[PDB]
Amino acid sequence: MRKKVLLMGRSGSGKSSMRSIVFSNYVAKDTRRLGATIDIEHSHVRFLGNLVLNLWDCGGQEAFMENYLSAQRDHIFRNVQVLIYVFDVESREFERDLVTFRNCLEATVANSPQARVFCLIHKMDLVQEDLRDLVFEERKAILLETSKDLETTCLATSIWDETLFKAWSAIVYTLIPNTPTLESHLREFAKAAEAAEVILFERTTFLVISSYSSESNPATDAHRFEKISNIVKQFKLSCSKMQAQFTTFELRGGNFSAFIVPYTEDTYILVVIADPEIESAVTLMNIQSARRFIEASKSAS
Amino acid sequence: SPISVILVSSGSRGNKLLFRYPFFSDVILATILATKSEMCGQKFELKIDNVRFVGHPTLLQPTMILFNVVFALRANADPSVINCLHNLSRRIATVLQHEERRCQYLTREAKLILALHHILPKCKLARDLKEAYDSLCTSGVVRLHINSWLKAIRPYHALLLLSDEKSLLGELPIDCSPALVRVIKTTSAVKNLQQLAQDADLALLQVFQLAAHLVYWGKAIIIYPLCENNVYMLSPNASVCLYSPLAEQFSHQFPSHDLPSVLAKFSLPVSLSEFRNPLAPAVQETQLIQMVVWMLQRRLLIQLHTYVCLMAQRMTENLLASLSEHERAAILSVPAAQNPEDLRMFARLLHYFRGRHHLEEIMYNENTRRSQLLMLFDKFRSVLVVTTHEDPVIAVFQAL
Amino acid sequence: TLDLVELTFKDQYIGRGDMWRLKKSLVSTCAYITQKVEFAGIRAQAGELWVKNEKVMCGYISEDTRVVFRSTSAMVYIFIQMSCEMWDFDIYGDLYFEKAVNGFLADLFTKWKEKNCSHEVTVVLFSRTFYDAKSVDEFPEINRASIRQDHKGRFYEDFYKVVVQNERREEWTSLLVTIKKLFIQYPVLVRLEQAEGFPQGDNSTSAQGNYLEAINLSFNVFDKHYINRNFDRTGQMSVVITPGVGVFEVDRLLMILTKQRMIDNGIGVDLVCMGEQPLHAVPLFKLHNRDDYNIPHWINHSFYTSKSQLFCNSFTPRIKLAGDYDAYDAQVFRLPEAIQIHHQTRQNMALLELAYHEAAGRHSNSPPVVPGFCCTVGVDWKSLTTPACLPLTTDYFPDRQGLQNDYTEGCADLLPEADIDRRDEDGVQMTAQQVFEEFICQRLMQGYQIIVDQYWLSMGRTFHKVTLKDKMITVTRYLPKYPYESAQIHYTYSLCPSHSDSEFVSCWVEFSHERLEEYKWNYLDQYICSAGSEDFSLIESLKFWRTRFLLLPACVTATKRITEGEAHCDIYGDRPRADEDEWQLLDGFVRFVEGLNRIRR
Amino acid sequence: RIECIFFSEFHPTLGPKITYQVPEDFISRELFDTVQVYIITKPELQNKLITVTAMEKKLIGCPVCIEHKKYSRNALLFNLGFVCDAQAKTCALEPIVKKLAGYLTTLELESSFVSMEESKQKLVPIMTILLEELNASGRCTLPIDESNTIHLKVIEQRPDPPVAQEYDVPVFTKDKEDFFNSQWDLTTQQILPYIDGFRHIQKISAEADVELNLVRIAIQNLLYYGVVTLVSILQYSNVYCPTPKVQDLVDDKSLQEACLSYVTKQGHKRASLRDVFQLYCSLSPGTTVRDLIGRHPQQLQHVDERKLIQFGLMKNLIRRLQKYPLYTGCHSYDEICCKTGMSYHELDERLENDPNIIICWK
Ligand SMILES: Nc1nc2c(ncn2[C@@H]2O[C@H](COP(=O)(O)OP(=O)(O)O)[C@@H](O)[C@H]2O)c(=O)[nH]1
Ligand SMILES: [Mg+2]
């Protein structure tokens, strides 16, 4: 199963930085040494087994993207699953960006009429904090006026905080099929194991595939998933400095207990128990019961 | 001799490399060799450091838009190698485009490639590209099992098949033309192309075009027909080694004789009539005829033709005065021009007496006997110069 | 057990006796790769370890492992021959100066940056221009002394343009720009572009050049290595870069003198930075000039090939001008059941006239791969980045008839504990093991090699036998009966220094070979053993290592003013530290001489 | 041959753009948009000598990448190249444009020639001078800076020479006295006075003291430069056959002039074309040189048969018949007589009674 994802945007908007940080295990300080992307850099990402993401890291320069809409129009915009257009919020040519975004939208509608548009308004860390909301809603009122042709969500991203993983989790959540089945599986696992919060990650990129939070969840932060993803990616890089693979995490807090163990061959599961009376050794094989069940299910199938 | 055969596709799924027979990476070569739709139908010549990529991109008319058959060359080669490799690439690309139009062959084989030593029996396209590479890398007879799918040829030449006729009818498809199967089923080593045209009820230009198509793909050759007056000669490119594979094939097909002995019988210029001894039976003679046909298929023999060069009523005088007066006075100094018929016989063949047309062409085009032409050479022995050498026309017809 | 281990020094001067002491300290120890070995201030790193021509990681030293002392801090000397071939092209379209500087010097400097070696580099451009004068009086009076006469009657002048004198610095690739700016103005410098009061002048061929004179100038530099001894450079190498193919037209006496000077110590490395390795014996000396051919095997020749495209590689250059029967047939191949006899003779073959006479002899009975002496030689980058020192051990030793046939034996006895009075804090009076070890160290520091207690020592044609038995030290010297009585060669040249632009100074120097048999070894043995003489450091023929230090006043304020950006440097008033406090500086000098005497207060 | 010299560079916020061209607007925007992949390339193709055939042209180039920290993002990405006609050779301008790319790389690394705007204006006079004196003379000497000067020279790009065997005979075609003999190679100076036109490679190697492999590589190098050419041994028992190029004798006047200046003896009159043509056409298999001499004494009065056979073999007017009997079929009598030591008559005495391998006239 191949999904074709377009990564378009203006010159210097930061598309290769997002591709390197999310998929190629870069950090934010290492993207300053990234060179210019000449034409299109095709990337194949093995994400959740049989599903393969075709990432088309297109060049953002003007002579490249005049060539994209004229000669390579049939090669690029045909069979497009997700179109990602990246907007630099510190760009002084936003009216020049809107016309090019309209041209890319017109080519995408004329070639692949069943596609989803994501407008990532990048470089939000260069905007001061109290102005970081009403500026973004200023652009979000424009692009949603522009993008009435297809389904479009606009997200404010930056590589120096947790919003990048939220945006890329929202991007790859639509590409994963049968997500109500995984949501029902996580709901039944949290009901069976008496867990407050069950979050399923990916093994390599650590993007949040699915999550389920019960009413007994002690966490009140709405941006906790991408924060935990950043935590486990930083610790995976710390383990990879020692040439070792992180396998299991166990915690016993004052009122909680968090367990990060591998679930499938391509996932990690975070299980949080809100009851301190439940020991670690009960939950650490309560997860293994479901792991043995899905191994027995996937052995026959 | 090219380095490699590269098949590069392009479309909405990205630039992909489908095949590369001698096992730059595949992703880098797929990025390099992929062209756009504006570059289709023209010659693609690209040289990176020392390798030269010659190909012909063709629009596929599925996610694929473009495909290209690319031959990699060492860039010290002649431009004739580049021209014939571009011709081979555009012919293979036209064949694959017609296969895509017919039965969706290229898209199905590309899906079989993308689903995946072991690739060669599983893929027919890998087999015919390997056959094209093996036909390019060797000067011998290599069978091109790709597809049939549709200049200086003379009417006195003969079309000789390089393989069995039954195998050629087996390889031809259901939708083949009636003219091609009539040409293959009708022709013979002795029967020339004019009798091939008037016996298979086809026009001569269509027979010439089918013969050119047959000798391009390595299924036939253009030779002079077999006759007892044909003086043969050992070719300089022949191999008389006992460890040669052609000697092994001659021992496998003819176990009664050995190849260096029979090639040593053709050391001196002798005809087929000089082989025929009263002690030798006719079965030995027919076996020798089959062996001559076999090593003419391997280009181990050359035919020596007699070439004549020129030195020092009203239409006869006009043709005699068409040339210079010094050679006219040299002709008048010969007393054998006092005959009335000899002047007309000399003046009728003045365009043929330049050393470019041999005696067989003169006796076929004018429908004259060899004895009359030898008598004409005896009358003008002090003017004409008579030499014997091989025909350079025969070396042009080869599998490119 | 290892059979080869290499130790590299860095930023530190190590004597040969100190290298022998380090080899004795590593005589029964295990060594691993990249191991810091320190012994009495001599720090060294184990570079590579070999067992049976294979690079290994560990090993053991058991008195049969030969050691190699390389240096990453050497007094290297680079000579560049700016002959007439430096303005010529090649088969790849590069100028030979462009090929040499842009390929070999850039590759050498980047490999020096890769190996992190800090050499003391001297770069000098040398050439020779032949004049058309037919007398001496055409040249001006101010520089007539540096103009010589050839053996063919031609008049020439040798030019030596120094661009770096003794500089040590990182990032040597900034040098090349200056070398490039000594390429444009070079024919103006060596009087090719019609200087005033001179003849025409033509730049010579690289074969007809001052190559051996440049080698002997580097040898004259390295002969006085004891005069200004720094404590942070160890090795010596002299590099000659030439745009000729490797052939030279040299003098016989100069070649004999250069070989005899290289027997005493081995420095000379030449490489060819033009390419095109010729199809003969490559280091070639055409004698009687400046035919009779000589092949020097004492030159470590190398060949540089920078970059190319597809073709076969040519080795010869191309030139265009400015502008009756059966007796002939038998002499075609003259001087250049029988079928089975002939075939078995050809099978018994497994070089032209030898095989032909072999066929003519054995027939009466029973009735383009390149050759090994012309193969492609690469650049010895190991000898040019980390130059190895002279080995402490040699295996050559003549027999008893050779030692009694051409050598004169003379013995000298030193009885210990009565003739020795070297006192260390009035303690033990320098026992005979210490004097014996000091004798071997003083022999090794002059350039002797140990022939593989009792030690046999050799340097050139002189042999030493230093024997310690039952408290007696016996030193026997074996001098040859027919010594190499060479002569002196007077040399005149034009020299431009490192900080001068176009002023060529007329200089002269004499090429001479030192006498190793005339060294006063008895005076050095008296200096080592006896403590009462001690004035032998003033004897110049003993070649004491010397260095000089000056104690200067520290005018920190005016120096900081000039280095801060003052335009005028004459801000010192009339005396350095003119008043200050006059007894504060004297008390500082009293404290300094207290530190000289190791007096603590 | 060079029709335009163009200098392109990678802009920030614009793609590959063309900055300077010598004949004003030669390269169109459609033509540059067709080949902008191969002009400003991906990092897998940088510092490579990429030439590509255009719609009607041949875009020669070499993209240069620097990758510092002081640049726009990280690197410069410039490209100076040539464009010629598509039917031209363009095999000699590729080292010229690679040397120009190296010149621009060293000039940028030394004095920042491409980064600074005041040195970008000097590229147009440099490229006008380059297009002026590379097309005309094929040699440019252009001083740029105080230390840098562009030195370029077109090499003739000769093809690869054939491998010279031990039995081959080198024959001069280029008149030795028109060479400065003092500045040849020393091996070539040893080999050249013993070449003549009738001596083997082993006979040169043994008549001199040069080794066989050294004289083989030297003859191959002289074949590379077109100085000598290889013919076979010219024994009087050789059998020659004519080639179809004998009519190319009388279809080309310059070949007739070369025959009448080469074949005729020293001090004699110029021979007739009829005699030389009849001597070429009388060569039949089974007849040696002695049969040609005894058959035609009138035509050999002012004709040397050695020079006749030599110029027939040089211009491929006649071929040879060597007898192929190690007694395998790979070697002829010339190879066996060159290897063992016997002459033709002795080897024919040994190999006449051959009941195992039968003689082949290949
Ligand atoms: N402050 C800030 N800088 C960014 C962000 N994203 C990217 N950058 C910087 O902007 C540059 C963008 O370069 P690149 O990703 O190659 O641009 P592209 O060619 O459009 O892919 C990088 O060097 C990053 O250091 C962001 O979210 N915030
Ligand atoms: Mg990018």
Swiss-Prot record, chain B:
Alphabetical keyword list: Disease variant, Epilepsy, GTPase activation, Lysosome, Membrane, Phosphoprotein
One GO biological process term: negative regulation of TORC1 signaling
Cellular location(s): Lysosome membrane
Domain of life of the source: Eukaryota
MF terms (GO), sorted A to Z: GTPase activator activity
Entry GO CC: GATOR1 complex; lysosomal membrane
Pfam families: HTH_NPRL3, NPR3
Organ and tissue specificity: Widely expressed. Expressed in the frontal lobe cortex as well as in the temporal, parietal, and occipital lobes.
Disulphide linkage map: none
Involvement in disease: Inactivating mutations and truncating deletions in the genes encoding GATOR1 proteins are detected in glioblastoma and ovarian tumors and are associated with loss of heterozygosity events. Inactivation of GATOR1 proteins promotes constitutive localization of mTORC1 to the lysosomal membrane and blocks mTORC1 inactivation following amino acid withdrawal. Epilepsy, familial focal, with variable foci 3: An autosomal dominant form of epilepsy characterized by focal seizures arising from different cortical regions, including the temporal, frontal, parietal, and occipital lobes. Seizure types commonly include temporal lobe epilepsy, frontal lobe epilepsy, and nocturnal frontal lobe epilepsy. Some patients may have intellectual disability or autism spectrum disorders. Seizure onset usually occurs in the first or second decades, although later onset has been reported, and there is phenotypic variability within families.
Annotated PANTHER family: CGTHBA PROTEIN -14 GENE PROTEIN (PTHR13153), GATOR COMPLEX PROTEIN NPRL3 (PTHR13153:SF5)
Family membership: Belongs to the NPR3 family.
Stated name of the protein: GATOR1 complex protein NPRL3
Source organism: Homo sapiens
Lineage, opening ranks: Eukaryota, Metazoa, Chordata, Craniata, Vertebrata
From Swiss-Prot, chain C:
Chain's role: As a component of the GATOR1 complex functions as an inhibitor of the amino acid-sensing branch of the mTORC1 pathway. In response to amino acid depletion, the GATOR1 complex has GTPase activating protein (GAP) activity and strongly increases GTP hydrolysis by RagA/RRAGA (or RagB/RRAGB) within heterodimeric Rag complexes, thereby turning them into their inactive GDP-bound form, releasing mTORC1 from lysosomal surface and inhibiting mTORC1 signaling.
Tissues where this protein is expressed: Expressed in developing and adult brain.
Lineage: Eukaryota, Metazoa, Chordata, Craniata, Vertebrata
Protein name in UniProt: GATOR1 complex protein DEPDC5
Associated disease: Epilepsy, familial focal, with variable foci 1: An autosomal dominant form of epilepsy characterized by focal seizures arising from different cortical regions in different family members. Many patients have an aura and show automatisms during the seizures, whereas others may have nocturnal seizures. There is often secondary generalization. Some patients show abnormal interictal EEG, and some patients may have intellectual disability or autism spectrum disorders.
Record note on modification: Ubiquitinated. Amino acid-induced 'Lys-48'-linked polyubiquitination of DEPDC5 by the BCR(KLHL22) ubiquitin ligase complex leads to DEPDC5 proteasomal degradation and inhibition of the GATOR1 complex. Ubiquitination may occur at multiple lysines.
Domain notes: The DEP domain mediates the interaction with KLHL22.
Outcome of swapping T242R: In DEE111; likely pathogenic
Subcellular location: Lysosome membrane; Cytoplasm, Cytosol; Cytoplasm, Perinuclear region
Family: Belongs to the IML1 family.
Shown chain mapped onto the complete sequence: 96 to 998 of 1603
Superkingdom classification of source: Eukaryota
Curated annotation (Swiss-Prot), chain D:
Effect of G15S: Abolished GTPase activating protein activity toward RagA/RRAGA
Annotated effect of mutating P193H: In FFEVF2; uncertain significance
GO biological process: cellular response to amino acid starvation; negative regulation of kinase activity; negative regulation of TORC1 signaling; positive regulation of autophagy
Similarity remark: Belongs to the NPR2 family.
Subcellular location per the Swiss-Prot or TrEMBL entry: Lysosome membrane
Known outcome of mutating K153R: Decreased ubiquitination by the GATOR2 complex
Effect of R295A: Does not affect the GTPase activating protein activity of the GATOR1 complex
GO CC term (a single one): GATOR1 complex
Keywords, comma-separated and alphabetical: Disease variant, Epilepsy, GTPase activation, Isopeptide bond, Lysosome, Membrane, Methylation, Tumor suppressor, Ubl conjugation
PTM comment, free text: In the presence of abundant amino acids, ubiquitinated at Lys-153 and Lys-339 via 'Lys-6'-linked ubiquitination by the WDR24 component of the GATOR2 complex, thereby inhibiting the GATOR1 complex and promoting mTORC1 activation.
Domain notes: The arginine finger is critical for the GTPase-activating mechanism.
Effect ascribed to mutating T105S: In FFEVF2; uncertain significance
Tissue: Most abundant in skeletal muscle, followed by brain, liver and pancreas, with lower amounts in lung, kidney, placenta and heart. Expressed in the frontal lobe cortex as well as in the temporal, parietal, and occipital lobes. Expressed in most lung cancer cell lines tested.
Site (Arginine finger): S119
Effect of R73A: Abolished GTPase activating protein activity toward RagA/RRAGA
Record keyword Ubl conjugation present: yes
Protein's name according to its UniProt entry: GATOR1 complex protein NPRL2
A single GO molecular function term of this UniProt record: GTPase activator activity
Main localization category: membrane
Region (Interaction with PDPK1): 1-128
